[PDB]
Amino acid sequence: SAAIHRTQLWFHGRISREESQRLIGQQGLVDGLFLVRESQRNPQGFVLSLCHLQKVKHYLILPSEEEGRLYFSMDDGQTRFTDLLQLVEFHQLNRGILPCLLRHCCT
């Protein structure tokens, strides 16, 4: 795969949930610290791991198709994005369904 999100510093590939929690814990547990990872079993799905109030939460991002166009969503199509970059860039400024903004790339 050569999707654009693979060029981003917040994208960490196929790391596990426990791994993402250790990585975020090692980097300060600061609010808004986040990464995006591939789901270990969902075809083309992703997980947003996010730190808020010293607790790491995980938000499933699933693909879907509307007519012939693909989009990603964390809320069953209430809010849709063409790619993970658009989703991340939106949530750096807007909380949406998240408890806080995406502030610092975990890397």
Partner: peptide, 8 residues
């Protein structure tokens, strides 16, 4: 909602 995840 998605079981095992924090989506709401």
């Amino acid at each position: 909602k998605f079981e095992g995840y924090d989506n709401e």
